[PDB]
Design a protein around this ligand. Structure first.
Ligand SMILES: [Zn+2]
Lengths: 386, 472, 99, 50, 201, 206
């Protein structure tokens, strides 16, 4: 790759998260239990994250070196390298929106101070405990009054139109979606001057500095409410088979199965038309499972099943182990031993045992034994050093 | 009252138990509401003269096998045994009732349907009848929704006035002349677009003929039926919110099976939502002793579906659970422990299926289980990977192309090309001999010879001296 | 112990010992500050690109060595490409400019 | 592979049906084999040494 | 993700649609205005010529290139010969019809009513010349539908809109063709509403 | 007749690049082809009667004539396969048919226009032609050929249209012509080119 520079980072819109993925993951199952080939449309697919064995379809109709780019018609695997099973992505299509637990519960609530809403009220709306108004018009209600279950119901009998109250994660997508960062930007450029308070006109310049970021950056506000959650590639959360029959799954195939299952049921209750005591309990139950995936622990700590330690979500993988996940690198060509004295050496030399130096400098030694003609080929040099 | 509670189970109970338990006579009261509910619906399909149209082809093909004896009838109310008579009892009033308007024009068409009340239908096609007249709305609705825009936002006409004469009828010339007659600019402008406003509602003119009646009767046919379903929607909901306390009592026995508590009692709801769907009260059995089956039915079907990572089928979990119900019973009697063969005697498996059922049920160890001493290490740091290849295994295949490009270059020219085309050496897919023979243009069994004697030459020594060295 | 080439881990492609060839040493965070103190910046690049983590930049550095051509083509480590797939799997979008 | 598939035809080295994964002594060790024990699943014949 | 910048009416865009709907490719089409899609598809297409394909990494125009791609990548059912002898036949036969007949229909639409008569009848005698040859196979020199007929099925569908027809000779062995090919679901589910009302089918 | 042998039949053009494009792929596969440098005023008889479209070149092998060089140089690359000239992967094979179409419709008409254009168009063509041919200059550093490290047909579409460089009055100029000019040292003297080049087209090289 070319001499890049300037890693650039920004929010991700549902029309882009739909652009990384190669297909929709629409079942919770992983493999087959009888022949361990992975199932179709499940988490570990082959039509989605590429093939399993290098250069061959899944059924077994395309193995020859003639067919090297075609996609099989039986099971639509593309016959390419199994390395590409490591850099593709899927995506789940949420049946209802849900707040991004980072941009909702990080201490300065980026959903909060973008709306000027106390965080204890947003949380009272994301659990479906208290209605919230949208577009009040000509009535006795602002744009963000918090009508409790009665006050709305004691308000709804009078007005039927010119008025809209919502509740839940699909409400904050309504507040953000209609709010405009230019009207309340310059209109707050005046409001800051009138205010005479060392605390008021000090936090007041904090909000107006956030609105001034959501415009030049190019991020709309309503992208902090997810609508298509993207799934990792199936070789960074492996299901490798141990020796003896047991498998050693990563702790993400326990969390992804818990979103695709709950999201799959909530697709059903809207077709079976259950009452709003259950489906309203479904979204409240889904949204706790998407936020147990991003950063598990800022909630009831959904501990692992079949065991008693907490699961390890995505944001608990970058998070410090005292340092980074990348390079802040175990290393080849190394060794270690017990040091001793050896006081006959010069200042610029150290001992090194024959049994070690013959093991670090192996690829160099292979050069001489094939350069001086002592070994015909490299396989015949590996047996001369052994 | 919202004392900073977080977990939903606190929020479920706090929201669920506001409602009150129903007395037994209350339950019969509610079911009698639904029982009038669907009767408002199905009796509001007899009003639809096309009610037998979707089925008259069935019985005109049931004998002739385009319909089966199950999905349309189940035993009439209040088989060649009954179908050949009751539907045959309809062949009299069938066309004779539509005879009048071929005045009592609506009595006969009603008289056919008036006796239709004793005709029993089946859950298969009941949906389609509701799906039939439903889309006729959208076929008439959005057209009528355009009548406003086509007359208001295009002619400047007001909307709330012309509807008085044309809505419901949907076919006459009400605003054709009555709207135009008022001497307004929009009315005189009505003659401008008077065709599209007249032609857009043409396909609905098929609709009234589609059921043969007027658009007025079609309105009450589809609209009066809607109250019947909504009569039951609020009815069924009243029973799901009432006995909702029950599922929590039935779903606590399964609290630890790999499924969360709150994913359990949501599975019972889809169960209990079906029980009251199929509930019948006339047998006298209280709702609890019938809803307890359909509820526990679900939570034992859900656990076999989404409890394992590597999912095992539903018919197998009955066999695994049988192996512990029986390997536990032999544990007390026998006292010591059970053997791999005594289960074969106690049960009736073929002595090896009990050896394949044992290599299944084990769950996957999590790849972050901290290994011994609880050091700064997990299990995922010790599982090497085998897809890769030894760089001395790749350094040979790179070296092998040296010999086969050099050794095979030490041949003749025309005899080396076919030696390279006969394998995939330095090329695409390999080839067939006479598939190659159309390349050298001498098509014969020579091609099986030229390679044949040439490959002998490389077989000789000192031409294979470097090539032999790759063996072992 | 001593190791010239052996196994490689599963998710991240660095070395470890399960094949009678234990992992390499731990070139931890404390030991990279002792290679930036000196100006040593060619030793530091190969010590975390070719010798450990790159996927096809090291299978060349083993075939250059056997031919006597000590010279490397670094490439980008495979432990950074997992850090883009692990950030994109949140809402965050991460990329690289072009110039 | 294609190149080696010519290497077989030249010498006729029969490809084996079975792969070798025997147990070999770890490197850098030497000492007599003082004891051997054999465990067999009940249902498979005992070989001569067993 | 496989999108197509289909034309609403032009036979070229109707060409690719038969290949897609035949093979079973999951595709989504984005329509052009009349024969112009937006000015926004010039970035992935410096020619701004439809049709144009975009499958997640790739850009292709000049359906000669497109159609052989979908045939070479989605293998079955195949739309070409098997051995190199006959592929030159099909690859050349389609070069005939795309050279003689297709540009011949230019002045029948974009040529004045004077030259419209010129292309009309001079083409018609060609139309029934190969007509008796349909007594050799079902399709245009094939016992199973292939790429070579892909230029005729969208071609024959334009007959009544242009104004040429069959009358006695040229209709017996010929009209059996269109009644055999116009029923295949591939050509069935390819028919767009704009290209349908040209004829009664 | 023409097809009456077990060998080809080609009625080439002695100056027309349609032949000379076909010549390289014709001989690069090592087949024995009949050359016939014929004219439009007087071609060979068989070129007139059996060729109901009457173009140049024209290949004829036991079944029928073939023309329209993309059809010709495809029939040989699909029937006489070794060595290969086109990739395996239908992704990289698509665009490899795409660059050729972006040369016969992009850098061909600059040759015809310079053959029948006005005095400024011969500069306007030479203007649009010469500078843009330097626009693709940095390509050759990454790849020893046109974005395909093996010799393939997309390169054969260039060299015959790079062998008529000064023939229509052209010369390169600017920074980095050594990269493209040094590249011409890597392709203009290959066996498939050296044995295939017609001496009639060579004399413009002095
Ligand atoms: Zn397959």
């Amino acid at each position: 790759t070319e001499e890049f520079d300037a890693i650039k980072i920004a929010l991700a819109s549902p029309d882009m998260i739909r652009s990384w993925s190669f297909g929709e993951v629409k079942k919770p199952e992983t493999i087959n239990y009888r022949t361990f080939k992975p199932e179709r449309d499940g988490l570990f697919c082959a039509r989605i994250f590429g093939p399993v064995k290098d250069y061959e379809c899944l059924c077994g109709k395309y193995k020859r070196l003639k067919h090297r780019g075609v996609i099989c018609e039986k099971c639509g695997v593309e016959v390419t390298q199994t390395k590409v099973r490591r850099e593709r992505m899927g995506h789940i299509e949420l049946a209802s929106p849900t707040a991004h637990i980072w941009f909702l519960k990080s201490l300065p609530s980026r959903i909060g101070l973008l709306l000027d809403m106390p965080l204890r009220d947003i949380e009272r709306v994301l659990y479906f405990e208290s209605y919230v108004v949208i577009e009040g018009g000509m009535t006795n209600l602002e744009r963000q009054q918090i009508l409790t279950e009665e006050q709305y119901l004691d308000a709804l009998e009078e007005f039927g139109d010119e008025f809209d109250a919502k509740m839940g994660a699909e409400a904050i997508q309504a507040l953000l979606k209609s709010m405009d960062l230019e009207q309340e930007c310059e209109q707050l450029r005046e409001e800051l001057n009138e205010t005479n308070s060392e605390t008021k006109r000090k936090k007041l310049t904090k909000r107006i500095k956030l609105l001034e970021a959501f415009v030049q950056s190019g991020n709309k506000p309503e992208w902090m409410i997810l609508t298509v959650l993207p799934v990792l590639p199936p070789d960074l959360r492996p299901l490798v088979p141990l020796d003896g029959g047991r498998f050693a799954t990563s702790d993400l195939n326990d969390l992804y199965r818990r979103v695709i299952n709950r999201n799959n049921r909530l697709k059903r209750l809207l077709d079976l038309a259950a009452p709003d005591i259950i489906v309203r309990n479904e979204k409240r139950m889904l949204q706790e499972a998407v936020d147990a995936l991003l950063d598990n622990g800022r909630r009831g700590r959904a501990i692992t099943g079949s065991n008693k330690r907490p699961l390890k979500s995505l944001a608990d993988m970058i998070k410090g182990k005292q340092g980074r996940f990348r390079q802040n690198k175990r290393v080849d060509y190394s060794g270690r031993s017990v040091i001793t004295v050896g006081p006959y050496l010069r200042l610029h030399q150290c001992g090194l045992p024959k049994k070690m130096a013959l093991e670090l400098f192996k690829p160099f030694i292979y050069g001489k034994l094939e350069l001086r003609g002592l070994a015909t080929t490299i396989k015949a040099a590996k047996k001369m050093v052994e | 009252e919202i004392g900073r509670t977080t977990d939903p189970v606190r929020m479920y109970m706090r929201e669920m138990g506001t409602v009150e338990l129903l007395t037994r006579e209350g339950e019969i009261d509610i079911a009698k509401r639904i029982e009038d509910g669907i009767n408002q619906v199905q009796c509001s399909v007899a009003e639809y003269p096309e009610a037998i149209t979707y089925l008259l082809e069935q019985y005109d093909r049931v004998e002739a096998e385009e319909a089966r004896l199950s999905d349309l009838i189940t035993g009439f109310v209040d088989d060649p045994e009954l179908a050949r008579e009751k539907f045959a009892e309809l062949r009299a009033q069938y066309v004779v009732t539509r005879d009048t308007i071929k005045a009592t024009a609506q009595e006969e068409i009603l008289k056919l349907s008036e006796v239709f009340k004793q005709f029993r239908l089946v859950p298969k096609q009941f949906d389609y009848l509701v799906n039939s007249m439903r889309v006729m709305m959208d076929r008439v609705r959005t057209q009528e929704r355009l009548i406003m825009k086509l007359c208001v936002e295009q002619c400047k006409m007001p909307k709330k006035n012309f509807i008085t004469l044309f809505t419901g009828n949907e076919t006459s010339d009400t605003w054709f002349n009555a709207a135009i007659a008022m001497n307004k600019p929009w009315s005189e402008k009505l003659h401008d677009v008077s065709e599209e406003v007249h032609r857009a509602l043409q396909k609905l003119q098929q609709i009234e003929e589609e059921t043969g009646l007027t658009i007025e009767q079609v309105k009450d046919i589809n609209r009066r039926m809607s109250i019947g379903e909504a009569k039951a929607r609020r009815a069924k909901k009243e029973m799901v919110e009432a006995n909702l306390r029950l599922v929590i009592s039935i779903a606590k026995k399964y609290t630890n099976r790999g499924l969360q508590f709150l994913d359990l009692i949501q599975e019972g709801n889809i169960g209990l939502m079906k029980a009251v769907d199929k509930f019948e009260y006339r047998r006298g059995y209280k709702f609890s002793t019938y809803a307890t089956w359909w509820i526990r039915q679900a939570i034992t079907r859900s656990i076999a579906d989404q409890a394992r990572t590597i999912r095992i089928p539903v018919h197998m979990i009955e066999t695994i659970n049988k192996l512990n119900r029986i390997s536990r019973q032999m544990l007390q009697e026998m006292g010591r422990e059970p053997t791999p063969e005594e289960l074969a005697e106690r049960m009736l498996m073929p002595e090896d299926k009990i050896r394949k059922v044992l290599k299944i049920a084990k769950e996957p160890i999590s790849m972050e289980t901290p290994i011994g001493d609880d050091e700064d290490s997990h299990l995922g740091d010790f599982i090497e990977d085998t897809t890769l290849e030894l760089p001395l295994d790749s350094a040979t295949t790179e070296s092998l192309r040296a010999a086969t490009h050099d050794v095979l270059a030490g041949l003749t020219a025309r005899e080396a090309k076919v030696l390279r085309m006969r394998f995939g050496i330095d090329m695409n897919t390999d080839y067939t001999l006479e598939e190659v023979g159309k390349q050298f243009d001498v098509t014969r069994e020579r091609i099986r010879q030229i390679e044949a004697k040439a490959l002998r030459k490389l077989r000789h020594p000192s031409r294979s001296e470097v090539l032999r060295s790759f063996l072992d | 112990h001593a190791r010239s080439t052996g196994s490689y881990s599963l998710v991240t492609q660095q070395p470890l010992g399960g094949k009678a060839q234990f992992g390499g040493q731990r070139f931890g965070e404390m030991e990279v500050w002792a290679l930036e103190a000196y100006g040593a910046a060619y030793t530091l690049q190969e010590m975390l690109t070719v010798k450990s983590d790159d996927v096809n930049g090291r299978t060349k550095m083993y075939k250059n060595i056997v031919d006597g051509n000590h010279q490397m083509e670094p490439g980008m480590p495979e432990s950074f490409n997992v850090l883009l797939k692990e950030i994109r799997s949140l809402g965050i979008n991460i990329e690289l400019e072009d110039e | 592979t294609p190149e080696e598939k010519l290497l077989r035809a030249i010498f006729g080295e029969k490809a084996s049906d079975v792969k070798d994964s025997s147990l070999r002594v770890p490197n850098g060790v030497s000492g007599t084999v003082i004891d051997v024990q054999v465990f067999t699943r009940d249902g498979v014949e005992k070989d001569k040494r067993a | 993700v496989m999108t197509l910048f289909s034309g609403p009416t032009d036979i070229y865009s109707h060409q690719v649609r038969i290949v897609l709907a035949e093979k079973g490719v999951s595709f989504e089409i984005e329509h052009v205005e009349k024969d112009n899609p937006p000015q926004d598809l010039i970035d992935l297409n410096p020619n701004q010529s439809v049709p144009t394909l975009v499958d997640r990494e790739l850009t292709l125009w000049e359906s000669r290139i497109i159609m052989e791609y979908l045939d070479e990548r989605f293998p079955h059912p195949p739309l070409m010969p098997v051995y190199p002898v006959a592929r030159g036949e099909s690859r050349l036969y389609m070069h005939r019809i795309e050279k003689d007949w297709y540009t011949l229909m230019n002045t029948i639409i974009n040529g004045s009513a004077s030259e419209a008569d010129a292309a009309r009848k001079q083409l018609r005698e060609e139309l029934l010349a190969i007509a008796p040859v349909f007594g050799q196979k079902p399709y245009f020199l094939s016992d199973e539908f292939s790429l070579v007929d892909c230029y005729l099925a969208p071609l024959l569908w334009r007959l009544p809109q242009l104004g040429i027809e069959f009358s006695g000779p040229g209709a017996k062995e010929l009209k059996g063709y269109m009644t055999r090919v116009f029923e295949r679901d591939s050509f069935l589910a390819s028919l767009t509403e704009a290209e349908r009302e040209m004829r009664l089918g």
